[PDB]
Amino acid sequence: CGWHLRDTTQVPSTMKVMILDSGDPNGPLSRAVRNQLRLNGVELLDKRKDVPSLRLGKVSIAKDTASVFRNGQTAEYQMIMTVNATVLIPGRDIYPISAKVFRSFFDNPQMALAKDNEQDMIVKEMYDRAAEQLIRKLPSIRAADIRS
């Protein structure tokens, strides 16, 4: 076998205190990222000048027709969310990172309002998966900064 319980925190110990910076601090991504950082036990500081700052950047969302029925009308949409972010470590380099999330749903022209509720609920979940994906890039930034 050879499995052991993970003996160190999911966030690197040089980043268990951190600054969070955004052009939209109140919006859905910044709320999901702040929740995922705080859930891991990161002490988050206001915008300690020696603390690293995670700056959230450009976000884009698109829905595209992923699939069609035999009359050329949409079957599935696919939604794709792209999040750019960058970690500034003071007196060191700037480490750019990103997340990319893919979700699908079927359309329905009957119950269009219900599929709009399903779309809003899926975009809400995509900000949580984009936040999870960004936190998993923090261990690689520690490794890259030691190797710098």
């Binding site: 109140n26 595209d64 309002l113 599929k115 709009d116 890259a144």
Partner: protein
């Protein structure tokens, strides 16, 4: 200028004039000439930057359409579109996502940037949000122009959050919505919802366990019931109060292993997750469904507290959803691969009183939803994705998709993709004539191929081809060439309707000329999505 030929509309040409009158806003006016029609369509695009945000308007207008006047005898064509998004100061989340057309057929007829022949409706939205770190409130209108319709007019959503109330974190979600229908004889409602929530997040280095409770409380006032209640055996009530506790437990662990046997200093991770959910049964057959569609269960969707996407159906629950993920990271701690597999076990039927869905099997208890994902970032140029959903109530794979991609550059790429949805899944989850009509009933089994490559220093060639494996016929195909300095030439064949007595598809064929790989890969139905 710009020019076109199509099977739908014969020769076309465009004479765009660009108008600049301010540093923050400008307009394009383009008389779109056509040969099958007798008249110029006038297209009017407007762009602005404002303190309230950035936005786009389009107004397209034909004074008279000779083809429509012959094909719809004894009866103008136009599109208006508006899109806006912004956050003024840092608190006012203003948005618009609105389009309106004269008639259902406008997107079968006219190629445009802001709708598709692929669309079943035109969406019509406005919202104002106020948001701050602890609180948000949103007022919105949700209307839909169906082409083959309930609206929310208005809807109010409100959230408040308060962390650290002892060991617990707390929130409340509240909503008020008025539902109106395009028909004079359909039910109306005003719905008020309240959802106070408390959770206890516990965690350490190797795991976590989150315990959460909600009260789900909803009030309906329903009107215009006479046409519905005179036709149906189970009656709607004029006032309904629905009150339900929800209880959830969401436990997780993380294990790791030395991956030296695969490559030098590689790292493997294993992540078992096991969530319990409870919600008691409340009969909702006296509540009309204005907004709750049945949800699609991907692997991350195995962990929801909702079976339906709205508030008019809330299924009972007494279930364990059990998953496992494993990951591989390289020596630099970059993630190279992951695979996730999970399932939902039900100790009691997931009933909602209005149990309207058709299944291949009569059992409702035990392990019966399964899903899995995989991703492999094979190198910095290659990557592979896959997903599967299975449902024992369908006795089949409910849905699946896959893709593999190569990119060297924004101009140099190849993608293969596949999408599948079973006949039994279409029967279970879509309007009950989809189970019978030949264009819908056969599921999905679609193969797609996409490519781009510079054929010489200044010349880029693009193409795509999508095939239905059940029809044994193309869904879409596209070809494009450009010469840079610049000129661009494109071709497309797409499905563009159906012929009802003959039971075969209609294809639009088109050729275009303009005076760029990513712009070309976006240009078809079924447009290119980067899957790395």
């Amino acid at each position: 200028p710009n020019a076109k030929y199509t099977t739908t509309n014969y020769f076309e040409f465009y004479l765009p004039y660009y108008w600049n009158i301010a540093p923050n806003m400008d307009a394009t006016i383009t008389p779109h000439y056509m040969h099958r029609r007798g008249n110029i369509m006038w297209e009017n695009e407007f762009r602005y930057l404002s303190q309230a945000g950035a936005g786009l308007m389009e107004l397209d207008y034909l004074p008279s359409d000779k083809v429509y006047e012959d094909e719809h005898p004894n009866d103008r064509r136009w599109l208006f579109y508006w899109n806006h998004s912004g956050v003024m100061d840092q608190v006012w989340r203003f948005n618009v996502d609105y389009t309106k057309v004269s008639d259902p057929s406008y997107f079968n007829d006219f190629d445009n940037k802001y709708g598709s022949s692929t669309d079943g409706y035109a969406t019509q939205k406005f919202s104002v949000g106020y948001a701050v770190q602890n609180f948000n409130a949103t007022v919105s209108t949700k209307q839909f122009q169906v082409f083959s319709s309930y609206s929310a007019e208005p809807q109010l959503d409100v959230n408040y959050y308060q962390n650290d109330v002892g060991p617990f974190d707390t929130r409340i979600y509240g909503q008020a919505v008025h539902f109106v229908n395009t028909r004079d004889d359909m039910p109306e409602a005003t719905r008020v919802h309240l959802e106070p929530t408390i959770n206890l997040p516990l965690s350490n280095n190797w795991g976590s366990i989150n315990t959460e409770a909600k009260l789900l409380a909803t009030h309906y006032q329903q009107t215009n019931l006479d046409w519905y209640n005179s036709r149906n055996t189970t009656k709607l009530d004029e006032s309904v109060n629905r009150v339900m506790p929800q209880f959830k437990v969401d436990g997780k662990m993380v294990f790791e292993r030395d991956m030296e046997m695969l490559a030098p200093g590689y790292t493997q991770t294993l992540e078992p997750r096991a969530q319990y959910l409870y919600v008691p049964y409340r009969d909702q057959s006296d509540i009309y469904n204005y907004d709750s569609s049945l949800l699609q269960s991907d692997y991350s969707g195995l962990f929801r507290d909702r079976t339906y996407g709205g508030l008019d159906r809330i299924a009972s629950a007494n279930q364990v959803t059990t998953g496992v993920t494993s990951r591989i990271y390289d020596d630099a701690a970059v993630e190279r691969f992951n695979i996730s597999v999970g399932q939902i076990y039900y100790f009691t039927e997931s009933r909602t009183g209005d149990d309207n869905i058709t299944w291949e099997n009569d059992d409702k208890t035990g392990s019966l939803v399964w899903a899995g994902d995989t991703y492999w970032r094979i190198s910095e140029r290659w990557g592979l994705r896959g997903g599967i959903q299975y449902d024992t109530r369908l006795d089949n794979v409910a849905t699946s998709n896959s893709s593999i991609e190569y990119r060297r550059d924004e101009d140099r790429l190849v993608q293969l993709n596949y999408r599948y949805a079973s006949p039994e899944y279409i029967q279970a989850t879509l309007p009950k004539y989809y189970s019978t009509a030949e264009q819908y009933k056969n599921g999905i089994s679609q193969v797609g191929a996409v490519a781009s490559w510079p054929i010489a220093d200044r010349w880029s060639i693009v193409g795509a081809y999508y095939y239905d494996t059940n029809a044994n016929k193309q869904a879409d195909s596209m070809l494009g060439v450009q010469y840079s300095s610049a000129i661009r030439v494109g071709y497309e064949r797409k499905l563009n309707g159906w012929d009802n007595d003959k039971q075969h598809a209609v294809y639009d064929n088109a050729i275009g000329f303009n005076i760029g790989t990513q712009e070309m890969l976006r240009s078809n139905i079924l447009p290119y999505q980067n899957t790395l």
